[PDB]
Design a protein around this ligand. Structure first.
Ligand code: 0KX
Ligand code: MG
Length: 431
DNA sequence: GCGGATCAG
DNA sequence: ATGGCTGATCCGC
């Protein structure tokens, strides 16, 4: 279906909804935040812009001098992961469009179904408008976890200190392995077909191994990115997707050749809002981001333009820092409307218990309980409280959450809170 | 330390 | 009729 034809059908089915109303209310809150930045741009002198340009360029010269091309970074991302698993274990779905999820929401969709515009985080009922011929299969998360365990076993060979970003996703540092691999016999890098095949000593080949072995072991395809830093690897991982690789060779020129015309949206970290904000300054590509680096040092905060500059120069992380200890744990749930207050407490109590049982698992305890309430027009509130004593049991959490919830019900009194979603988070763990 | 928001997969 | 979850972080206050 045509790109014009898609955005129309959604607008047809979506217009008038409670959800839709909130999306406008958000888009207005966005556009206002744009217009303010513009009214702030207007009041910048050529002198300030100059003073900035030297400040940024002194920093940029520090970053460029610290650049590091000596590491080899691989990013693996499974192709249509949940869909592919369901396709794998049901041939009848192979030549056909599908989506994993419910009528309420979709986790993913196979490439047959994207051609109709159905994708992740789209509700099922809308995807059925975009394609009535769509088969929605409920998610089997346990299978997906098990598949992930099968691939993480492979990936351990090449980097034991690899880090996984989800089930389908993982960065690897293959520098220590590529070093060892140069002087390996063909016997140590031969794999039989499920007849025998051997793979080369190059980075492109090591990754072809990984992708091969995965397809043998799981009968599923993955794409990969090869580059000197994580940020980069992550971008090219999506370039030849599905079932394909891409390398940025470790030399300054090749890096910059790619960056040159790369849209900012294709970077991990730059989402829809930031795209629109930077688009409002005529910044769409990564060289335009470099050009305006002075302007960006005055409009955005220190951490933001620092980040933008790393991106501008094609820098990123080159060692995979081990997964640190968690800083929060949470649970939330959607339901058909709840307005009777006693039911809202009972639900809060259930979420609080679940959250308690999750902490029990990891033997953690915290000081800051935070509820989350979403009403039937999709407006989200959060309410927190921090306590002196560390808490952990179902009761203690509920004790604190009950009061926070009370404060809210009393606030609208006599009106009932019309909730569609409630949540409970705990945070502020020890040092 | 809080609440609202963005982003990721 | 049906518009998800969990965790991390940032911005402004
Ligand atoms: N919003 C989202 C995004 C992804 N997911 C799940 C479904 C995906 O199969 C899995 C991995 O996401 P992903 O790598 O971004 N894309 P996916 O594997 O579906 O296909 P490709 O983008 O690799 O072609 O996370 C989700 O449940 N909710
Ligand atoms: Mg994927």
């Amino acid at each position: 279906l045509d790109k014009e034809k898609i955005n129309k059908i959604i607008m047809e089915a979506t217009k008038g909804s409670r959800f839709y109303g909130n999306e406008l209310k958000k888009e207005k809150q966005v556009n206002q935040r744009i217009e303010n930045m513009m009214q702030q741009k207007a009041q910048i002198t050529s002198q300030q812009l100059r003073k900035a340009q030297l400040q940024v360029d002194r920093f940029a010269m520090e970053l460029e001098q610290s650049r590091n091309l000596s590491n080899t970074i691989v990013h693996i991302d499974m192709d249509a992961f949940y869909a592919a698993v369901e396709m794998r274990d049901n041939p009848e779905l192979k030549d056909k469009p599908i989506a994993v999820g419910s009528m309420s929401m979709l986790s993913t969709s196979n490439y047959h179904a994207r051609r109709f515009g159905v994708r992740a985080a789209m509700p099922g009922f809308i995807a059925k408008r975009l394609c009535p011929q769509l088969i929605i299969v409920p998610p089997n998360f346990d299978k997906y976890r098990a598949v992930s365990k099968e691939v993480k076993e492979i990936l351990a060979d090449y980097d034991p200190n690899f880090m996984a970003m989800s089930l389908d996703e993982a960065y690897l540092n293959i520098t220590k392995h590529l070093e060892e691999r140069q002087n390996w016999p063909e016997d140590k890098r031969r794999y039989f077909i499920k007849n025998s095949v051997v793979f080369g000593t190059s980075a492109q080949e090591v990754v072809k191994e990984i992708r091969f072995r995965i397809e043998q072991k799981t009968t599923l395809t993955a794409s990969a990115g090869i580059a000197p830093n994580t940020m980069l690897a992550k971008v090219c991982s999506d370039k030849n997707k599905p079932n394909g690789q891409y390398q940025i060779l470790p030399n300054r020129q090749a890096v910059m050749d790619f960056i040159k015309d790369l849209p900012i949206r294709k970077v991990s970290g730059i989402g829809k809002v930031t795209e629109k904000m930077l688009k409002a300054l005529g910044i769409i590509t990564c060289t335009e981001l470099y050009q305006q680096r002075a302007l960006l040092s005055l409009l955005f905060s220190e951490t933001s333009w620092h980040y933008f500059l790393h991106i501008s120069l094609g820098l990123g992380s080159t060692h995979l820092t081990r997964d640190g200890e968690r800083k929060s744990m949470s649970v939330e749930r959607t339901f058909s409307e709840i307005n009777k207050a006693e039911e809202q407490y009972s639900l809060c109590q259930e979420l609080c218990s679940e959250l308690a049982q999750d902490l029990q698992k990891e033997r953690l305890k915290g000081r800051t309980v935070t509820i989350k309430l979403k009403n039937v027009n999709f407006e989200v509130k959060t309410r927190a409280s921090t306590v002196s004593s560390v808490v952990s049991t179902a009761e203690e959490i509920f004790a604190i959450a009950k009061e926070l919830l009370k404060t809210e019900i009393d606030a609208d009194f006599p009106h009932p809170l019309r909730l569609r979603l409630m949540g409970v988070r705990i945070s502020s763990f020890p040092n």
